Design a protein around this nucleic acid. Structure first.
Ligand SMILES: Nc1ncnc2c1ncn2[C@@H]1O[C@H](COP(=O)(O)OP(=O)(O)O)[C@@H](O)[C@H]1O
Ligand SMILES: Nc1ncnc2c1ncn2[C@@H]1O[C@H](COP(=O)(O)OP(=O)(O)O)[C@@H](O)[C@H]1O
Ligand SMILES: Nc1ncnc2c1ncn2[C@@H]1O[C@H](COP(=O)(O)OP(=O)(O)O)[C@@H](O)[C@H]1O
Ligand SMILES: Nc1ncnc2c1ncn2[C@@H]1O[C@H](COP(=O)(O)OP(=O)(O)O)[C@@H](O)[C@H]1O
Ligand SMILES: Nc1ncnc2c1ncn2[C@@H]1O[C@H](COP(=O)(O)OP(=O)(O)O)[C@@H](O)[C@H]1O
Ligand code: ALF
Ligand code: ALF
Ligand code: ALF
Ligand code: ALF
Ligand code: ALF
Ligand SMILES: [Mg+2]
Ligand SMILES: [Mg+2]
Ligand SMILES: [Mg+2]
Ligand SMILES: [Mg+2]
Ligand SMILES: [Mg+2]
Length: 1609
DNA sequence: TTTTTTTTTTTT
């Protein structure tokens, strides 16, 4: 075995034998730009340095001869070949091997070795493993020849992925398995970092692993630097190795050799060795002796004879220039084209993009990719070059291209049908030699033929990737031999599950990375502004890959809209920077002469003096470029025409043509229904044959806007379709907005794939003009719908959308169909920089949209009292047909739509076409109205004059102004419709007007005034409703009243008690049929929602209510600890739930009501700090949202007997929003329905009211509201009559074997739920014993009475709060004592660290059995609570001071609040299922509050306010505290009763004192002055003595107590 | 033969 150096010392060591073995095969592989070619050239250079002869087979067609020279290669003696086919490449290898005159041969890219059959055949033609069998045959033949000539053959290879492998390294290598076996050495090379000169990236930090080795041990590795334009930092290695081997001394930063200092810092020591080559050789020789395992490494006139002969043979076999010395190959010289940006041309090092090469440009949407591309085309055309543009994205604006200086009339342009077609056109144009630059717009849009013909949702895993890989193989050679530049534009995608480095990728696989000679990352970094107006984009381009000069330089410039790259701007900045242009303050000077004040003016001057500009530019280039360069056309036109004729013959008529003459490319627009929006869009409306996205918050007007565009289109004879994926379209409302309901095609699809397949089918028919998809957020993948809630389908919707765009874009353009996608907003978590808002469904839509609109409600339109419309703003956030970032403001008037004529007035006035003198509006001298309202009415009334004004407003304000047949449509329409129905079932698409299942049906809410407020008379069936409000505002109550009303009509209901706080007895009092109410207290939030889905799908349940989304705790959270962060886990759960539920609920006609709680949003001192739990999804999916609030007390003199209540309709999709209802909730009775009826009756003049007397139809019905109410309750028939009339008068939107299938399906779904989630997971409320309320005494009799139920409820949460020393702990210990006295087990969490055990004993606590904990952190305290709850062995737990519950992070805003909120979520369920009472004591901070946030307010079943109101005195001594407790919240009995008792110190609550007072109050104990008597017998004088007597007579005391309880409980 | 592509707030 004999070896050759690799050019790296550490690699030579890693290889064990000191280098690569002669007469063997070697493979080198790695990612793009990892240093494969470089390494290879370094081995060639080292070999040549020793008199060896080398050959380079550049199959990749990307060798830079000048660069090879810089790496020390003898260019003039390097044999070089750029072969046509892979077989040719390998035949040359064999011939060179057999000659015995070549020492090392390197083949650059086996990946580029294309079989002859493949080259000749089309792109997208199958030749399975043809390259593999070719390689296999080559090795067989080569191995023997290489050995007998002692020739080293190095194969460079690229990396590919292996699709379908979910188990081990997914990486592979090209060209099959043969090379693996035949290689004596295999090397894996990788770039592991950057080498930096402060700012500049000057090299690559590199690692090589010896992955296979037949000449020494494998698996050693080398690390070294590749310095650009220099090569392997050899002397760097030498320093490190020298130091490591103790030949070079290193004291701190000082390097020494043999006593003499050689440099400070690695950089300087390296420079010294470079400078002293003799000493370097000495050190190297020693390093090798020390570290190499093996000791390795007429006569030449026979070589030259045989060389010339083999060379002559190769040329005879394969043609003239098939092999030659690199130095003399002119076709190998790098030639460049300007990019249109001066600073980019500088960044690229060589002055522009290289001819005959592939270039990639990628970046986010609207970053300037197409623009840049067109600017390079314009520059090329300006120099007489010929260009072609492949518009695969179907979004090129010819007029815009012209504005950027493109010669539209000579730009070849193609909008190809398939990706293979696109690439076949590229190949054909390349091969012709008549086209100079070709740009392919979006590889992302290059859709494989099989994908286009397949359905949406069919998987074609890496079909585009393998297509691209085949394309590069074929294109690289053709492009070089024609000197044609090919630019690929690419989009960005996210790679999922990557939280390390860069999550960004590029479309179309890995091939392009490798084959690109330059890769550019372009980005918008800011706005260019003319004060107000955004007039351009501030832009940055990074040179991310570079094969013709150093990489990683960057350019910054402006893109000015409608003008292009600000070239002269760059020139000023560069001129100033290079001291060619002088800048004194704001004054710019050239050669002494002032050229302008401010950058703007200096720029204008250069534009004006082109000769001087050229001079400055020439100098800037000389100063800043690192790699500067230095019958004929009638053959071109002949070959061009022939290739063009060929393309048209192969792919049909208009498959390629001059842009200027393609009529189908002219942008045509449709009105949006808003005039100011049409103006904002620049072109006058939305573009036909394009994709548009509209997004914004809930109820911002997305659907409305969309329907207005449909209406306007229909008004012009166009055909429209509406895909209601959100399942929330109101046909009657659509009609009010002027939509032709009877001709609007409408679909409520089952899956997202179905929705998109329908879009495709409608597009392809060519019979539909505009299609709108309502909510991409609602487009649920098939796998997701069939899966369970909580199954993860990470980015399944995203990959679906990405596939859809690919297929849709082409079809929409060729049918001239407008597709509008509505989207919702989501928050992106962990983003406190810029904008936390996003959009659903991934990144594809951003890129493919020609227009993106951000719509927002910015205020209310008011008729004094009534909210009659929404004030609206739309921002044009993306625009491909005119400048972006303009905005529109208009009104949406409910039940009417966009106020188009309103805009017209304002615009008319603004443009001085309509005169406005005070309040009077005039047109052409004639008065048209007083006030905006009347002027609007006038224009509406005079449509001809309105058109005239509108036409003028458009002329004045638009920047981008515009301009058998139907029986084929109807034929194709019917066919596509028939197809859709055959594929997806009967009613899967139909005319809206005739879809009965779309009509809105309602259920009463139990409140008459609410039913009126809702406009439609109640809540809508088959929809989602949300109710939210503060604690005890009446959410559950309202809900139960709707259930009761539903049951009263024979409907079936279910209640999901996630809050674990439903009182069955109370539900009964509110009129609920307890025995038939399905009830569930689920363990996790996913379970709760899975039950909802299952009940919905059964079709046997009519209304379902979920009590507290706030209580819907994700499974991961429940199983995790308290204080574990599950940021937005509940939100993503809710978001998935809505997606699945919406469709099921509609198709079963099931109403789902979600109750929600309120939380505060921290750091918000602007508008409303209130929010709702569980994220944003529910806002969007709810058809009605209700805000309920307690606004006062209903009183029977003393007693609080009900709550005065207000409900605001905060969102409404079935009638106008923002109306409100006010009614009473009477405790233990419910909503006072007949009360409302009286008030409404009187208000509507149906019931007469003379003073206090109420009359109906002449006959007196009662004196006072109370009695009139009683009368209606008593005469139900008359009440119905009055109610019917009140509804007719006040509703704005009035409505209009069978049960044995229900019971069969119900039982089945119930059986299923129980099988899935365990025994008692759902049952009838009436028979659930675990739901009954059980109580524990508080230790105070009067408190037990105040609580109504006789004490605190087991399995619930209780809060006690009050000032310091008010008796909180005491009370708590008394409840513990009472519990222990009954054999219960108690625990005390002393977070306040202030429990006195001796005192607890005095209050009668069993100290020895009281579990006690003084926890370190709040999370620990609560984790202990949870653990004790879950054990089921503790009966009552008290936590002393939530105020003392300090979060873990704090012992290192609202951290405690979010902790408490998480705790309640987890505790509520566990406490109920163990029947454990948890009491929280709280402190005070009405200006009073409580610690630890809002959660506890909501979750407490009882809240107690305790207060010291005076002193108990033994003459002198204060011996106790006089105490008052108010029941401030109560879920088990009426609230607001109060107790008063004494706390006697060292004794506790004075129980017998209470007994006296109660006894006296109830007339059981007689009190004559100061004398107390029982049953005639005197028991004491003064309260003190009576108390002592009862204490002394316990039997009598029991008797009195028993009676007091019977009377007062 | 050879990758595909994000999800979504928390709470005085
Ligand atoms: N002509 C050149 N001028 C300056 N730097 C170059 C040149 N060619 C390559 N480089 C740099 O050398 C490194 C490796 O290049 P190369 O050996 O071509 O990688 P590979 O062959 O593995 O694709 C890259 O960082 C690249 O930018
Ligand atoms: N027809 C047009 N009129 C005005 N501005 C445009 C037009 N087309 C593109 N622009 C603006 O130029 C910038 C870059 O657009 P473009 O080059 O199409 O980006 P990309 O191709 O990278 O998606 C964006 O700000 C865009 O709005
Ligand atoms: N059927 C209807 N009757 C009355 N007003 C409606 C109706 N539908 C929607 N609106 C009102 O119009 C505005 C926008 O509604 P919509 O276009 O559905 O919002 P989005 O689709 O953005 O969620 C809201 O104020 C809404 O309450
Ligand atoms: N079991 C009950 N007995 C008497 N009054 C009750 C009962 N449950 C609730 N209430 C009262 O009805 C009103 C509304 O209670 P609720 O509907 O549970 O409020 P929310 O569900 O909004 O927290 C409150 O005044 C509450 O005290
Ligand atoms: N160990 C004790 N000895 C005497 N008096 C006490 C003792 N502990 C509490 N008190 C008195 O009992 C009353 C209420 O105390 P406590 O129940 O601890 O109030 P809180 O816990 O609400 O601050 C106060 O007047 C206090 O002075
Ligand atoms: F293999 Al390369 F640029 F030559 F990625
Ligand atoms: F790449 Al684009 F609009 F053309 F984002
Ligand atoms: F997008 Al919506 F109600 F339809 F907020
Ligand atoms: F929402 Al509640 F008591 F049920 F405040
Ligand atoms: F002493 Al305190 F609440 F004030 F326990
Ligand atoms: Mg290379
Ligand atoms: Mg583009
Ligand atoms: Mg909508
Ligand atoms: Mg409730
Ligand atoms: Mg205390």
């Amino acid at each position: 075995v004999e070896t050759i150096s690799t050019g790296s010392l550490s690699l030579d060591i890693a290889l064990g034998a000191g280098g690569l073995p002669m007469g063997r095969i070697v493979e080198i592989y790695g990612p793009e730009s990892s240093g494969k070619t470089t390494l290879t050239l370094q081995v060639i250079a080292a070999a040549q340095r020793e008199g060896k002869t080398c050959a380079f087979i550049d199959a990749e067609h990307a060798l830079d001869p000048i660069y090879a020279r810089k790496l020390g290669v003898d260019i003039d003696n390097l044999l070089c070949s750029q072969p046509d086919t892979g077989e040719q490449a390998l035949e040359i290898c064999d011939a060179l091997a057999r000659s015995g005159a070549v020492d090392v041969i390197v083949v650059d890219s086996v990946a580029a070795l294309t079989p002859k059959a493949e080259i000749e055949g089309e792109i997208g033609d199958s030749h399975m493993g043809l390259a593999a069998r070719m390689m296999s045959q080559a090795m067989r033949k080569l191995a023997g020849n290489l050995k007998q000539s002692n020739t080293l053959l190095i194969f460079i290879n690229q990396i590919r992925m292996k699709i379908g492998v979910m188990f081990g390294n997914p990486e592979t290598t090209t060209g099959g398995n043969a090379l693996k076996f035949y290689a004596s050495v295999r090397l894996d090379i990788r770039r592991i970092g950057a080498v930096k000169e402060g700012e500049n990236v000057v090299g690559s930090e590199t690692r090589v692993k010896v992955v296979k080795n037949k000449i020494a041990a494998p698996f050693k590795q080398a690390e070294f630097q590749i310095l650009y334009g220099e090569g392997i930092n050899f002397y760097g290695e030498l320093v490190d190795l020298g130091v490591k081997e103790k030949l070079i001394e290193k004291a701190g930063a000082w390097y020494s050799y043999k006593g003499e200092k050689i440099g400070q810092g690695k950089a300087n020591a390296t420079a010294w060795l470079k400078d002293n080559p003799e000493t370097a050789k000495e050190i190297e020789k020693k390093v090798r002796e020390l570290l190499l395992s093996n000791p390795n490494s007429a006569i030449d006139e026979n070589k030259q004879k045989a060389l010339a002969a083999a060379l002559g043979q190769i040329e005879k076999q394969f043609g003239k220039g098939s092999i030659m010395r690199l130095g003399e190959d002119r076709s190998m010289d790098v030639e460049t084209i300007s990019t249109g940006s001066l600073s980019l041309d500088i960044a690229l090092g060589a002055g522009g993009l290289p001819m005959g090469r592939i270039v990639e440009i990628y970046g986010p949407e609207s970053s300037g990719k197409t623009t840049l591309t067109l600017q390079v085309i314009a520059a090329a055309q300006r120099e007489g070059k010929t260009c072609a543009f492949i518009d695969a994205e179907h979004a090129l604006d010819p007029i815009y291209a012209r504005k950027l200086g493109v010669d539209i009339d000579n730009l070849l342009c193609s909008q190809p049908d398939t990706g293979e077609q696109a690439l076949e056109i590229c190949d054909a144009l390349a091969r012709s030699g008549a086209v100079d630059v070709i740009v392919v717009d979006s590889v992302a849009a290059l859709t494989p033929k099989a994908e286009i013909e397949g359905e949406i949702g069919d998987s074609h895993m890496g079909l585009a990737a393998r297509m691209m890989s085949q394309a590069m193989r074929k294109l690289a050679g053709n492009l070089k031999q024609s000197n044609t530049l090919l630019i690929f534009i690419n989009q960005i995608r996210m790679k999922i599950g990557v939280m390390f480095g860069n999550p960004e990728t590029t479309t179309g696989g890995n091939a392009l990375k490798f084959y690109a000679s330059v890769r550019l990352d372009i980005r918008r970094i800011g706005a260019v502004k003319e004060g107000e107006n955004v007039v351009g984009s501030e832009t940055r381009v990074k040179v991310v890959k570079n094969k013709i000069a150093a990489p990683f330089k960057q350019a910054e410039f402006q893109i000015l809209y409608g003008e292009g790259i600000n070239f002269y701007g760059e020139l000023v900045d560069l001129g100033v920077k290079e001291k060619l242009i002088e800048k004194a303050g704001a004054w710019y000077s050239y050669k002494g002469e002032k050229i302008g004040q401010g950058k703007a003016n200096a720029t204008a001057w250069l534009k004006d003096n082109p000769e001087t500009a050229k001079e400055i530019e020439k100098k800037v280039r000389e100063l800043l470029l690192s790699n500067p360069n230095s019958a004929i056309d009638e053959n071109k036109q002949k070959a061009l025409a022939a290739a063009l004729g060929q393309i048209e013959k192969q792919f049909g008529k208009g498959s390629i043509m001059r842009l200027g003459e393609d009529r189908s490319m002219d942008v045509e627009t449709i009105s949006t229904g808003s005039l100011s929006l049409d103006i904002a869009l620049g072109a006058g409306g939305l573009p036909m044959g394009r994709i548009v996205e509209i997004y914004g918050p809930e109820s911002s007007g997305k659907t409305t806007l969309t329907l207005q565009v449909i209406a306007a289109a229909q008004r012009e004879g166009k055909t429209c379709a509406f895909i209601d994926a959100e399942h929330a379209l109101d046909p009657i409302y659509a009609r009010k907005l002027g939509v032709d309901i009877d001709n609007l095609l409408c679909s409520q699809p089952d899956t997202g794939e179905q929705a998109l397949e329908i879009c495709d089918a409608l597009a392809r028919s060519g019979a539909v003009d505009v299609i709108v998809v309502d909510s991409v957020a609602a487009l649920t993948p098939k796998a997701e719908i069939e899966g369970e809630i909580g199954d993860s389908h990470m980015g399944l919707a995203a990959r679906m959308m990405s596939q859809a765009m690919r297929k849709l874009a082409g079809n929409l353009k060729q049918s001239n169909t407008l597709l509008i996608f509505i989207n919702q907003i989501r928050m992106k978590i962990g983003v406190m920089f810029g904008n936390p808002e996003t959009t659903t469904g991934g990144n594809a839509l951003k890129f493919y949209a020609s227009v993106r609109l951000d719509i927002r409600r910015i205020g209310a339109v008011k008729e004094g009292e009534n909210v009659v419309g929404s004030e609206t703003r739309v921002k044009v956030v993306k625009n491909k047909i005119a400048a972006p970032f303009k905005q529109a403001e208009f009104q949406i008037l409910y039940g009417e739509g966009i106020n188009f004529y309103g805009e017209l007035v304002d615009l008319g006035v603004k443009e001085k076409l309509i005169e406005k003198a005070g309040a009077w509006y005039s047109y052409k001298g004639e008065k048209i109205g007083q006030g905006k309202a009347n002027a609007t009415a006038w224009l509406k009334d005079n449509p001809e004059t309105a058109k005239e004004i509108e036409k003028k407003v458009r002329e004045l304000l638009l920047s981008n102004p515009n301009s058998a047949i139907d029986e084929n449509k109807q034929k194709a329409l019917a066919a596509a419709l028939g197809q859709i129905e055959k594929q997806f079932g009967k009613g899967s698409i139909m005319r809206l007007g005739e879809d009965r299942s779309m009509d809105v049906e309602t259920i009463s809410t139990g409140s008459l005034s609410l039913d009126i407020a809702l406009g439609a008379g109640g809540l809508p069936m088959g929809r989602i409703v949300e109710i939210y409000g503060p604690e005890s505002s009446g959410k559950t109550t309202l809900t139960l009243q709707v259930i009761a009303a539903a049951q009263r009509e024979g409907k079936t209901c279910a209640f999901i008690d996630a809050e674990h706080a439903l009182d069955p007895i109370y539900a009964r009092k509110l009129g609920v049929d307890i025995d038939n109410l399905l009830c569930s207290q689920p363990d996790t939030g996913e379970q709760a929602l899975e039950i909802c889905d299952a009940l919905a799908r059964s079709g046997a349940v009519d209304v379902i209510v979920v009590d507290s989304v706030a209580a819907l705790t994700p499974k991961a959270e429940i199983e995790g600890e308290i204080g574990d962060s599950h940021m937005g886990l509940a939100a993503r759960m809710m978001s998935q739930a809505m997606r699945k539920l919406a469709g099921n609920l509609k198709q079963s006609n099931t109403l789902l009501i979600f109750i929600n709680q309120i939380r505060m949003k921290i750091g918000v001192m602007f508008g409303n700090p209130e929010t709702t739990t569980g994220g944003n999804a529910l806002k969007f999916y709810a058809s009605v949202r209700l805000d309920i609030r307690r606004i006062g007390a209903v009183k029977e003199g003393e007693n609080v007997v009900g709550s005065e209540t207000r409900v605001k309709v905060v969102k409404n999709k079935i009638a106008a929003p923002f109306k409100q209802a006010e009614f009473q909730i009477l405790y233990g009775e419910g909503i006072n329905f007949y009360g409302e009826l009286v008030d409404l009756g009187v208000k509507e003049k149906l019931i007469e009211k003379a003073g206090a007397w109420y009359s109906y139809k002449g006959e007196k019905i009662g004196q006072g509201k109370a009695n009139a109410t009683a009368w209606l309750k008593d005469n139900p028939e008359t009440a119905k009559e009055i109610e019917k009339k009140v509804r007719e008068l006040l509703l704005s939107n009035p409505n209009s074997a069978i049960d044995e299938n229900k019971q069969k399906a119900l039982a089945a779904a119930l059986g299923q739920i129980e099988k899935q989630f365990g025994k008692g997971s759902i049952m009838r409320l009436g028979e659930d014993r675990s739901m009954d309320v059980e109580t524990i005494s508080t230790g105070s009799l009067s408190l037990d009475i105040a609580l109504g139920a006789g004490g605190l409820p087991m399995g619930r949460i209780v809060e006690i709060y009050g000032p310091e020393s008010s008796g909180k702990t005491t009370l708590t210990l008394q409840v513990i004592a009472a519990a222990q006295r009954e054999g219960k087990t108690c625990a005390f969490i002393d977070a306040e660290h202030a429990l006195d055990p001796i005192y607890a004993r005095k209050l009668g606590v069993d100290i020895d059995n009281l579990l006690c904990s003084q926890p370190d952190t709040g999370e620990q305290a609560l984790e202990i609570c949870d653990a004790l709850a879950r054990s089921g062995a503790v009966d009552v737990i008290v936590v002393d001071s939530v105020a003392a519950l300090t979060p873990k992070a704090e012992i290192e805003m609202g951290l405690a609040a979010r902790m408490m909120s998480q705790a309640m979520r987890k505790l509520a369920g566990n406490l109920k299922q163990s029947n454990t009472l948890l009491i929280f004591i709280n402190q005070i901070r009405n200006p009073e509050t409580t610690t630890g946030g809002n959660a506890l307010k909501f979750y407490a079943s009882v809240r107690l306010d305790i207060r010291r109101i005076g002193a108990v005195k033994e003459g002198e001594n204060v011996v106790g505290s006089e105490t008052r407790v108010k029941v401030v919240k109560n879920k088990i009995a009426a609230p607001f009763k109060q107790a008063e008792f004494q706390i006697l110190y060292g004794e506790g609550i004075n129980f017998y004192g209470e007994l006296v007072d109660l006894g006296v109050k109830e007339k059981l104990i007689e009190k004559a002055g100061a004398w107390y008597s029982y049953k005639g017998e005197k028991i004491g004088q003064g309260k003190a003595n009576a108390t002592a007597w009862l204490k002394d007579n316990p039997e009598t005391a029991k008797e009195i107590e028993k009676k007091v309880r019977e009377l007062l409980l």
